Design a protein around this nucleic acid. Structure first.
Lengths: 186, 56, 102, 50
RNA sequence: CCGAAACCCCCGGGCUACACGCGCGCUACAAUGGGCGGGACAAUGGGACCCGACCUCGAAAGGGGAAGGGAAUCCCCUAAACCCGCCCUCAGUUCGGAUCGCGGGCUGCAACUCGCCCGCGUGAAGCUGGAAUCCCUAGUACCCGCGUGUCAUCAUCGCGCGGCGAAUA
RNA sequence: AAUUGGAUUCAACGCCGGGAACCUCACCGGGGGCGACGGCAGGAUGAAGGCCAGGCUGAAGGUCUUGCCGGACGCGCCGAGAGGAGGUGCAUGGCCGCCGUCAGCUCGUACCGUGAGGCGUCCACUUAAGUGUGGUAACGAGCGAGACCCGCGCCCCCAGUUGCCAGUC
């Protein structure tokens, strides 16, 4: 159409592929998608803590990811690349997806909180927060707030500097919302 | 018995019932038509990845 | 020779200026006469939206900006002197249009 | 399904076809002979008797 | 919890029913006025089965033809309030526009239920409102139009723009 | 006949509805209709799907009478699926309203108290502020708020196909 619409079209294109791939690549450890868009073959760069899951169990998942990409888009030769995230513990969205699995697993609240806090502070976190809104295994709507170091400030040069990762860790009695807000040194 | 197919076959030429989103699959709930058909509620969740800015 | 227009827009400020500056620096020295990188408008796009999904009480209402900025460049060089200058990396996310007339 | 549908008659060393063959399209398509009104078999066409 | 169903498909009807009650708003009770004409002025924005120059027919709504435009370069587009002269000379009226007859366009398969506009006829309540009560402190309120969203079509709505421009603290 | 539902004092009532003529749509009336995957018995001795023509349907081989093709696999139940805008927001995640664009909440070490705790963060002065000032058995730090980000006035540099009888043979 014009200049204005196309940019928004592209950005809408980012979401439909970033939404699905997160939900699948929770086994890998999803952290991002650097999407390079061309008329030759859409080049998606999937970010994982671990590349050995994304490839698959023998080529299946990388081909599966090549095959659903043809359906959504009109570039029918989309490449796949796996780049590692360089600090997955500096990435919050990784820690949210990583914490979600552990609560899916059944490990206790403050324990499942402590380790997490401790692995990213070791990594280099000026400050960190984990919040867990949910049932908290009764039937009252209370969140538990695990707190160390600095935090998100005021305004918006608040939220740009910090990291923020959200994940619904499913249970079979209810649900628990996993928020992980990291503050990197800066 | 026997009968021919159905997947809906009535008029839906235009209006709200014509539209659906590409995230929560609705007719009557919001459809922002700029080539970004979603509801108002999705819009808010999606935008920081879009590159829209909160600031007025 | 063939007067070409590079019409280059971008969604963000930092990405558009670096390319406009680099295009006026590399083209300067070769077989190119180049007219300066002119800024046209920001067709700032306002999306003006209801926050609350209840639509209830007072609902605070988001103002949205999408700002798309357009630099324009006339150039007198060949179609071969054009690709040499279009080598550049370019931010994601920067549209570069090319009209060709004599 | 719907048995029985053995409507092709039998000669002693030959076969013959009970029903009519269409005159709008070519041979290969039989007619539900109503006596005045011919249905079609491949697809489903309103045909009248010629 | 439902399992030819609290599913599924369809047409038609219902959400737009009303003796009434309230909430939030628009329009309004005229001479700081109405007609008619003339002249001087904006801004945000939106624009491809989309904005539509301009030319023509039609009283008009609109129809026919057709330039440019995917945009500081073209289109919606005329701002409205203003002022100057002229006609009119405070009545439920030349106010005000409900209600009803008719003629007519426009979209869609289709607007009786249930769309809007245009013309002629029709021409209702209302002539400053009890108890009670709300909003706001300056380029704001008060006031005037203007755009956009959603979007064929229902806008006296929501968001947003500029024009005139204070009282009291 | 149904006038779908929810919302209900501030904080439900131009609210979910940023778009109800069909659609939407969840309600009503009528006609018509799919049930995976396994087990069980059935199979091509021809369709599970299509179809004239009446007879019926507001229409639909839809249904019956009735006659038949293209090429080949599916009922009935029994576990148990898909579907449900079907119930529970006192089971929830998300997000949001209001209290509140308010001015609070904490930790270290020290100090005090048998202890719950205290002190500090109290007092005086001062600000929209635990803001700052002085005092004081405290000294500091984080969050909040603040600056920070965006927008508005005035100027300048870079850049001009917007801009004009500016200055002009």
């Amino acid at each position: 159409m014009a200049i204005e619409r196309y940019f928004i079209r592209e950005a809408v294109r980012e979401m439909l592929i970033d939404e699905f791939l997160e939900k699948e690549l929770r086994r890998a450890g999803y952290g991002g998608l650097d999407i390079k868009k061309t008329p030759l073959g859409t080049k998606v760069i999937i970010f994982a803590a671990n590349p050995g899951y994304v490839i698959g169990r023998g080529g299946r998942r990388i081909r599966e990811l090549t095959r659903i990409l043809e359906k959504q888009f009109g570039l029918e030769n989309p490449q796949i690349e796996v780049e590692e995230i360089k600090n997955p513990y500096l990435n919050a969205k990784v820690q949210a997806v990583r914490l979600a699995q552990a609560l899916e697993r059944g490990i206790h609240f403050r324990r499942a909180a402590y380790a997490a806090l401790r692995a990213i502070m070791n990594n280099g976190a000026r400050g960190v927060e984990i919040r867990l809104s949910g049932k908290l295994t009764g039937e009252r709507a209370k969140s538990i707030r695990f707190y160390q170091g600095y935090l998100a400030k005021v305004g918006n040069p608040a939220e740009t500097l910090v990291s923020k990762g959200y994940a619904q860790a499913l249970l079979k009695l209810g649900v628990i919302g996993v928020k992980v807000a990291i503050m990197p040194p800066g | 018995m026997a009968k021919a197919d159905y997947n809906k076959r009535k008029p839906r030429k235009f209006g709200k019932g014509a539209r659906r989103c590409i995230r929560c699959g609705q007719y009557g709930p919001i459809i922002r038509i700029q080539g970004l058909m979603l509801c108002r509620h999705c819009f808010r969740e999606v935008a920081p990845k879009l590159g829209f800015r909160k600031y007025e | 020779m063939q007067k070409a227009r590079i019409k280059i827009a971008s969604t963000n400020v930092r990405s558009l200026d670096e390319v406009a500056n680099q295009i006026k620096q590399i083209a300067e020295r070769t077989g190119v006469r180049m007219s300066g990188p002119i800024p046209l408008p920001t067709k700032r796009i306002r999306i003006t939206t209801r926050k609350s999904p209840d639509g209830e009480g007072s609902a605070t209402f988001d103002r949205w900006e999408l700002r798309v900025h357009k630099r324009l460049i006339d150039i007198e060089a060949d179609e071969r002197a054009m690709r040499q200058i279009m080598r550049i990396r370019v931010p994601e996310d920067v549209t570069i249009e090319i009209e060709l007339i004599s | 399904m719907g048995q029985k549908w053995k409507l092709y008659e039998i000669k002693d060393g030959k076969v013959i076809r009970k029903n009519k063959f269409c005159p709008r399209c070519g041979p290969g398509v039989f007619m539900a002979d109503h006596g005045d009104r011919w249905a079609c078999g491949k697809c489903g066409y309103t045909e009248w008797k010629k």
